Amino acid sequence: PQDVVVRLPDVAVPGEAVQASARQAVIHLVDIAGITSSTPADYATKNLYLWNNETCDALSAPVADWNDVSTTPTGSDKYGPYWVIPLTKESGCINVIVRDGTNKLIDSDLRVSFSDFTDRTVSVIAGNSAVYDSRADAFRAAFGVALADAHWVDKTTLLWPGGENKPIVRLYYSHSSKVAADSNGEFSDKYVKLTPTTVNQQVSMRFPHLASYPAFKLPDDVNVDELLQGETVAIAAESDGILSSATQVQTAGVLDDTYAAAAEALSYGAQLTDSGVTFRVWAPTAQQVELVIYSADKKVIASHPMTRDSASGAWSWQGGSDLKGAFYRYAMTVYHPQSRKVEQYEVTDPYAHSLSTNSEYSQVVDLNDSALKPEGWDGLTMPHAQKTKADLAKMTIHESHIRDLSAWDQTVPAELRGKYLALTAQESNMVQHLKQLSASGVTHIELLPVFDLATVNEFSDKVADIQQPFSRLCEVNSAVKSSEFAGYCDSGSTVEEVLTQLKQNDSKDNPQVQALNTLVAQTDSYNWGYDPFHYTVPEGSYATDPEGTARIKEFRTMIQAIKQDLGMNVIMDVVYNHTNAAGPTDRTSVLDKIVPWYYQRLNETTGSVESATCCSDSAPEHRMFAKLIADSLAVWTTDYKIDGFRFDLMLYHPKAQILSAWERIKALNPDIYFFGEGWDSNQSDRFEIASQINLKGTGIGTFSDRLRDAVRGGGPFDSGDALRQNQGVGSGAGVLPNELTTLSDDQARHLADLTRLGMAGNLADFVLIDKDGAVKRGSEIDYNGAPGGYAADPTEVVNYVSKHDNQTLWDMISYKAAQEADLDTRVRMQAVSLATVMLGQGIAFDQQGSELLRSKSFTRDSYDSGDWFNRVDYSLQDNNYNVGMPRSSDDGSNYDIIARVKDAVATPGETELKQMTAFYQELTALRKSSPLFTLGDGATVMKRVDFRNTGADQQTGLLVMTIDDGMQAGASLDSRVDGIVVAINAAPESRTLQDFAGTSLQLSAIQQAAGDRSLASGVQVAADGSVTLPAWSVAVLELPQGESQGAGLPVSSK
Ligand SMILES: OC[C@H]1O[C@@H]2O[C@H]3[C@H](O)[C@@H](O)[C@@H](O[C@H]4[C@H](O)[C@@H](O)[C@@H](O[C@H]5[C@H](O)[C@@H](O)[C@@H](O[C@H]6[C@H](O)[C@@H](O)[C@@H](O[C@H]7[C@H](O)[C@@H](O)[C@@H](O[C@H]1[C@H](O)[C@H]2O)O[C@@H]7CO)O[C@@H]6CO)O[C@@H]5CO)O[C@@H]4CO)O[C@@H]3CO
Ligand SMILES: OC[C@H]1O[C@@H]2O[C@H]3[C@H](O)[C@@H](O)[C@@H](O[C@H]4[C@H](O)[C@@H](O)[C@@H](O[C@H]5[C@H](O)[C@@H](O)[C@@H](O[C@H]6[C@H](O)[C@@H](O)[C@@H](O[C@H]7[C@H](O)[C@@H](O)[C@@H](O[C@H]1[C@H](O)[C@H]2O)O[C@@H]7CO)O[C@@H]6CO)O[C@@H]5CO)O[C@@H]4CO)O[C@@H]3CO
Ligand SMILES: [Ca+2]
Ligand SMILES: [Ca+2]
Ligand SMILES: [Ca+2]
Ligand SMILES: [Ca+2]
Ligand SMILES: [Ca+2]
CATH class of the missing domain: 2.60.40.1130 (Rab geranylgeranyltransferase alpha-subunit, insert domain)
Structure with a gap:
């Protein structure tokens, strides 16, 4: 009305002042302030500071004297000054700082690259580090x-x-x-x-x-x-x-303030009801949503404008029951801030529960249909309780991957290899081995991504795997024909045969196994799958048939076989902290096409999708994504009968959101267990993150990196010589040093503090004697600066010494073991390492194949390293060690130390694999042999768990833990014993315990039954109660219980 019009300055858009000629560059300074004319501005004090270094050296006559201000403008017009800068060449770049006198007008060393700006005539503005191709652009x-x-x-x-x-x-x-x-x-x-x-x-x-x-x-x-x-x-x-x-506007907050209350009350996706099917999608900013129905062969057979609900911003449409099984997409008309275009595109349903091949179309499905269930599904029971804290503490996890399980197993029928249904091949080597592990006390299979991942092509015609002819690889991968392996296109042999042949002359100088495998990786069936396409559909490539609903029944048939035939619970890895892609164009951008800039976390200044997770960071702090997460978990819980969930990068989620989600899921099944990896995401400025520290008391578990690093040695970012120098407790830090390490005794005792603390559940308030003989609370033991102990209950702590990411335990031991440690000793180092986990109070977690000395040929990060480096041989011929140098892109800076350590001893064979498996099952049997190992409750741990051999004069590497089942502890939780002693002698010397002299201690019956094959072979208990421990041994001892609860092993008040 009376308002003043907002307008551009009343001056034209500027052209260029001059264009650089040969051996010249030209820099315009666009005088924004003086463009608002008024006074004819004076540019006499404007000058350039120009210098040549090694990055940018194309300046003819630079002047390094910073106090020289004589490089003043060549000329100027109403838009600003400009500089004609002589050059020695027209390739490369020049360094410039733009100044007034000695003050910088742009506080940033400028690079002007003649490659990026071919006419070498650029413009800049004060207080702005960007270099523009023209004054108009600027x-x-x-x-x-x-x-x-x-x-x-x-x-x-x-x-x-x-x-x-x-x-x-x-x-x-x-x-x-x-x-x-x-x-x-x-x-x-x-x-x-x-x-x-x-x-x-x-x-x-x-x-x-x-x-x-x-x-x-x-x-x-x-x-x-x-x-x-x-x-x-x-x-x-x-x-x-x-x-x-x-500037553009970020609207996620007002979208939640406006719509979230109403939108949260609705259900989403294609939902079968009494009357028919209700479709609903949340798209509060969309101008039009059209429901497009497709035939089986993907012809549009109907297109329905949907009904917008103005309270929620959701769009809905109702149709007939015959739409069950139909394919569909939402045809969106919606503005996307990234492109600033009203976009038009068809997107699959973020609440999809069935998919076509490669996730191109969503599909209407009723997960309740008995046709999608294996016989008996509805009565499938959880073979392991998770109700009490003592129940949860018994959890012993085997972290597995669908291809890692079966891709190599010839005793799995060929068509089931790398498939969900391989778990039904009851006579296979792999399933029998899993059944043995379960009988011995592995309780849980944890599955790497089996939701719909993006990074495997589910069109089998477009994929070549190493078991198929090399000619098939050339057919599908057009990079192979111009590679140095092109000659194998006609060879008539498989890719697996070629990789084997490449082993012979493979070295740090000729890394040819890895070179061919990098091409294999682009078009094979292999990925860890941390690449979410759809959150609530099973992955299709693990199905025998990825087209439509078939994957749903095969997934359930797998879940049923694990619970019912193998006797284990099932945990799913879930990745809600990021999407595979964002923006309005990428194939796998789903959430961000439908509600642009709502489901992704954005930079507060630029609105770019953040990538701190690796990829396209999501926004679980936003209310409708929190609801998507919770609704998603409800399907996996109810319809797929998943016993627990491991959140990838859980620290990127709000603590409140995780707890919210958990209360939502416990209303469905109270015994569902949540845990994740809770580091520092750098998001605490936005909300209280779901971190190890903040989740104390909540009952949400977290992976503990404390015992992990103490026992393995070093940390996941070590490289080069540090990989060998940084020995752990498991590899003989301070007691069997290698030729490079400088670990002091104090440093070794510090690792033993972290280990003991972890074996008592890594509690913040557990009290122990530290490396200096000083009394410390768990939180007072340092861990790279943080409080070491952080939990309230041991069920909040997941201990491990090996996982899918970072090097396998065996490869760490190979990096770190002294040259004098022979093969048998390294096998015992592996079992000693795993004993700290398996006999500790924290939840026990391990990588699939640790019981087989699993190697990845030193690969640190094998997510896309294919069948070759992730191989697990259930025929027990070898542990996949020394099968070629790992990928140079991530381990090239470790080739030198690899070649130095790789051949110190023989590669494990069937004899070593069977021994490790026996060690492993011995350990897991011990863990479940007494309630005392898995007390569940933090205060109960504090009242019953103690340690001998502590302080400045401890025998280095001897871990002695006592668990009290005597009167002062309280109730006798174990009818057969008054106490348990765990002795892990991670050392080359035999040691004698006198702490229990005169006490009637005796060796656990399990270990006596293993005899020569026991981790405690050779342990001697003398008449006086003194115990002699062999080198590199693990012994579980017990005070036999009498007619009533005895004195046991009272914890000392320190
Ligand atoms: O070999 C010298 C130097 O070369 C390269 O530096 C570039 C630099 O990247 C450009 O920015 C520019 O430097 C300008 C500054 O932009 C300008 O502000 C001013 O610098 C002043 C500083 O702000 C002020 O702190 C002080 O500098 C001190 C400094 O605090 C000391 O630490 C010491 O600096 C040494 C550096 O630490 C060292 O890395 C190296 O510097 C390289 C640099 O790596 C490379 O990027 O050597 C220097 C010592 O020679 O000494 C100075 C003592 O004064 O004071 C200055 C103002 O005097 O001026 C500089 C240029 O003089 O251009 C340089 C290339 O010249
Ligand atoms: O974050 C980028 C990162 O992405 C990938 O790393 C994974 C990694 O494979 C996982 O193990 C996990 O890392 C966790 C650790 O499990 C956990 O212990 C903790 O890490 C701490 C370390 O124990 C501690 O030593 C220290 O690390 C320093 C480190 O010494 C520095 O070198 C530097 O690390 C950088 C890396 O060198 C660099 O490669 C990259 O890391 C990638 C990695 O390549 C990839 O495989 O960037 C980091 C920059 O931080 O700094 C760190 C810390 O300043 O401290 C850490 C932190 O507490 O936490 C981490 C995760 O934060 O998960 C990561 C991420 O997915
Ligand atoms: Ca230009
Ligand atoms: Ca997929
Ligand atoms: Ca791959
Ligand atoms: Ca931030
Ligand atoms: Ca007892």
Whole structure:
């Protein structure tokens, strides 16, 4: 009405002042402030500081004297000065700092690369590190839309820095095109006016990382629905109406404030009801949603405009029951801020529960149909209780992958290899071995991603695996024909045969096994699968038939076989912390095509999707993604009967969201167990992260890296010689040093503190004697600066010495073992390492194949290293060690230490594999042989668990843990013993325990039964009660119980 028009400056868009000639570059400085003319500006003090280094050396006559300010403009016009800079060449780059006198106008060393700017004529603006190809580009950067640092966070609140102390602050909006200056240089699109305000108490709680932003108020009567359906741009301008800045707007907060309450009350996806099928998708900013129905062979057979619910922003449509089994997509008409286009594209359902091949179409499914269930499904029971804390503590996890299990097993029928259904091949080597492990006390199979991953092509015609002819690899992988292995295209042999042949002359100098495998990896069936395409459909490539609903019944047939034939519970790895892709174009961008910029976490200034997870970071702090996560877990829980969930990068989730999700799932099944990897995501400024520290008391488990690093040695980022120098307790730190290490006795005793603390459940308040003889709480033992112990209960701690990521335990032992440790001794180092986990109070977790000395040929990160490096040989011929140098892209800087250590001893064969398996099953049998091993409750651990051989004069490497079942502990939780002693002698010397002299201690019956094959072979208990431990041994001893609960092994009050 009376409002002043916002406009561009009343000056033209500038052309170039000069263009560089030969052996010249030209830099324009675009004088934004003086473009708002007034005074004819003076550029005499403007100058360039120019110098040559090794990166950029194309300057003819640089002057290194920083106090020389004589490189003043060559000329100037109304848009600013410019510099003609002589060069020695027209390739490369030059270094420049843009100054007024000795003050930098741009606080950033500038690179001007002649490759990026071919005409070598660039423009820059004060207070801006960007180099522009032209003055027009730079001009439109200053007077044009840029970045996205405005945040519309609820109905009436915009947070934006660009607005602070400006006469005009307005929220412009255009339904159908990009807000831009019109032909009169004016911004004539509709706008809402914003007045300064103060951030409110609940916005600052919601977005703490934004609470220091200049706040602004919208009229209470603004119709948010209309603004949110197109582009919105926050604009600020001076008194005269000249644009000061303009930026795109992030709207996830106001979307939640507007719609989330209503939208959370609805159910989503294609849902079978009484009357028929209800489709519902959440798309609060979409202009149109059309439900497209497809025939089996993917012809459109109907297209239905959906009904928008204005309270929720959800779109719904109702049709007949005959739509069960039909394929469908949502045809979206929606503005995407990244492209600033009203996009039109068909997207699969984020609540899809069935998919076509390679996830191209979603499919209507009723998971309850008996046709999709194996016989007996509805009565499938959990073979291991998870109700009490003592129940949870018994959990003993075997972390497995669908291809790692069966890809190599000739006794698995060929068509089931690398498939869910391989777990049904009851006579196979793999299933029999798993059945043996279960009988001995492995309780849980944990499955690497078996939700719908993106990074395997489910069209089998497009895939070549190493068991197929090399000619098939050349057919599907067009890079092989121009590679140095092209000659094998005609060879008539398989890829597996070629890789084997390449072993012979493979070395750090000729890494040819790895070279061929990198090409194999692009088109094979192999990936860990941490690449979410759809969260609540099984992966299709693990199915015999990926087209439609078949995968659902095969997945359940697998789940049933694991629980019912193998006797184990099932944990799923889940990856809700990121999506595989974002933006409006990428094939696997689903969530971000339907509600752009809502499901991804964005940079607060640029609005780019963050990638701290690896990929496209998600936003579980946002309410409708929290609901998606929880609804997703409900399907896996109820419809697939999953006993627990391991959250990948759980630290990227809010603690409140994880706990919310968990309460939601416990209402379905109270015994469901949640845990994850809870490091530091660097998100604590946005919310309270779900980290090891913050989850104390909550009952949410976390992987503990404390005992892990103490027993393995070093840490996951070690490289080069450090891989060998950093020995662990399991590999003889301080007692059997290798030729490189400098580990001191103090350092070795510190690792033993971390190990003891972990064997008592890594509790914050457990009290032990440390390396110096000092009394310490678990939280007082240092771990790389953090409090070491952090939990309230041992069930909150998952101990392990090996996992899918980072090197296998055997490869660590190979890096670190002294040259004098022979093969048999390294096998005992492996079992000694695993004993710290298996006999500890924390939940026990292990990588598939540790019982077979599993190797990945030193591969640190094998996620895409194929069948070759991830092989597990259930025919027990070898442990996959020394099968070629690992991938150079990630382990090249370790080739030197690998070649130095690799051949110290023979590669394990069947004799060593069987011995390790017996050791492993001995350990797992011991773990479940008494309730004392798995007390579950932190206060109960504190009252019953203690250690001998502590303090500054301990025998290094001897771990002696006592577990009290005598009167002062309380109740006798174990009818056969008054106490247990665990002795792990990780040392080359035989040792004698006198702590139990005169006490009637005796060796556990399990170990006596193993005899010569026991980890305790040769242990001697003398008449006086002194115990002699062999080198590299594990012994479990017990005080036999009498007619009543005895004195046992009382914990000392320290
Ligand atoms: O070999 C010298 C140097 O070469 C390269 O530096 C570039 C640099 O990247 C450009 O930015 C520019 O440097 C300018 C600065 O931009 C400008 O601000 C000013 O620097 C002042 C500093 O702000 C101020 O701290 C102080 O510098 C000290 C400094 O604190 C000391 O630590 C010491 O610096 C040494 C560096 O630590 C060392 O790495 C190396 O520097 C390299 C650099 O690696 C490379 O990127 O050597 C220096 C010592 O020679 O000494 C100085 C003592 O003054 O004071 C200066 C103002 O005097 O000025 C510099 C240029 O003089 O250009 C340089 C290339 O010249
Ligand atoms: O985060 C980027 C990272 O991505 C991948 O790493 C994985 C890794 O495979 C997993 O083990 C896990 O890492 C966890 C650890 O399990 C956990 O212990 C903790 O790590 C701490 C270390 O124990 C401790 O030594 C220290 O690490 C330092 C380290 O000495 C530095 O070198 C530096 O690390 C950098 C790496 O060198 C670099 O390769 C990359 O890491 C990638 C990695 O390549 C990939 O496989 O970037 C990091 C930058 O941080 O700094 C760190 C810390 O400053 O401290 C750490 C941190 O507490 O936590 C980590 C995860 O944070 O998960 C990661 C991520 O998926
Ligand atoms: Ca140019
Ligand atoms: Ca898939
Ligand atoms: Ca692959
Ligand atoms: Ca951040
Ligand atoms: Ca007892």
